[PDB]
Ligand SMILES: NC(=O)CCn1cnc2ccccc21
């Protein structure tokens with residue numbers, strides 16, 4: 001992969017692997033989400049964040065995901081080459097935004113798009129903080145100055161408020177636990193694992209007859225390595241669903257989300 | 265990737281990804297196992313397979329793994345390029361063997377090796393069968409004729425008999441269930457998921473202070489999508505060795521047995 005000519009965005013190509021595909025022989029949404037995070041990590045490395053600055057490190061500050069929104073028009077097939085372009089933008093003191101565009105390498109056609117909201121958090125106390133000028137200035141030289149959005153349309157799905165699913169849930173998958181393969185290099189549960197857990201409570205019939213078109217996921221709290229999760233889903237409708245991930249015992253909310261599925 | 269000049273083996277390069285590494289910033293054994301299976305699949309495609317012959321498809325026959333043996337000397341770091349060479353060999357009527365060699369692309373040094381035993385099975389009845397001549401002839405033109413082994417040594421670890429772990433287990437991890445990401449394109453649990461399940465019952469202290477050098481895993485029975493698994497481990501041993509058992513949570517039906525050898529960091 002490489003930064004583009006202006007140095008304000010990053011592109012990378014991926015050949016879809018045999019173990020990365022589902023029953024349709026196309027990439028799963030978890031494979032896509034792993035590639036989005038891989039291209040984000042390579043962008044941070046390419047510009048010297050080897051994604052915290054020296055100022056953030058001295059104050060024990062990290063960027064954490066608050067929201068992830070992905071829209072797929074066509075999933076790449078096993079053996080296909082997909083090209084992903086990524087860039088970041090400041091959202092004032094609220095935090096930052098990372099956007100992505102996915103294209104079929106052979107046709108140049110946009111096959112997907114994603115956006116994510118990141119907030120600054122103290123790694124030890126877990127307390128959220130607003131973005132200061134000293135930090136903003138250090139990142140702004142790596143972002144386009146004019147707005148550049150993967151989801152520019154007015155009243156789009158990436159900025160919609162998500163309600164809390166009320167008991168009883170129509171569907172559920174309980175006792176979900178992370179294994180070592182679900183943890184990142186810092187021993188925290190990978191963000192993509194939560195997408196998988198959300199999808200576990202969708203009935204197999206919907207998965208067999210529909211394709212996932214849109215997923216919006218809010219991250220409220222992290223799941224620890226020794227935590228147990230319950231995945232809850234209710235049909236709200238194309239089929240639309242409301243989702244809730246919560247700790248198995250006390251019922252503490254870890255995530256909330258929505259999915260939209262198209263008939264095959 | 266590509267077949268080599270003689271067309272009897274296949275090579276491929278991989279750049280290690282950020283989500284593929286563990287706490288030491290190096291590839292996990294599950295990432296290595298996924299790459300071994302990816303290079304095996306690309307080898308089958310490059311020579312016209314999909315990895316059944318037309319004769320096997322007529323009889324509803326498939327190749328299934330009976331044993332997997334992996335030895336890692338050095339795990340590749342995040343951002344490193346690893347080169348993997350793979351080839352197959354017939355083992356008469358018992359089945360076939362797929363071997364692999366892993367190298368650091370920059371130094372050319374062998375950083376790992378693996379071997380696996382495959383048997384022919386009817387897809388529907390799940391009954392094993394010996395390799396017939398008609399089938400053997402169809403894949404022998406894709407294999408080296410002189411023996412070529414990743415583990416040539418006389419008393420190597422890849423051919424050792426594995427005993428059944430006796431209750432009580434020293435360690436255990438109970439209630440393990442596969443999710444959709446653990447299934448392959450045919451909705452069967454991926455072979456690599458069983459390696460992860462075996463490793464789940466190793467204490468975190470061993471993982472934090474040791475590196476996995478060798479893993480030998482026997483595949484006895486398949487875990488269904490709605491099955492629940494119990495992972496059991498007992499220390500058998502500067503090096504720590506363990507005996508492993510995966511069994512169904514209810515009836516205690518054996519799905520896998522294995523051994524691991526770990527060295528101090
Ligand atoms: N959302 C993020 O990836 C936060 C870190 N970050 C903010 N602006 C950036 C520009 C380039 C690389 C990482 C950047």
Ligand SMILES: NC(=O)CCn1cnc2ccccc21
Pocket residue numbers: 304307308311313315327352353360361362382403406407
């Ligand atoms: N061990 C296997 O991968 C079984 C299938 N198979 C047998 N001989 C082969 C030669 C090349 C590719 C796949 C082959």
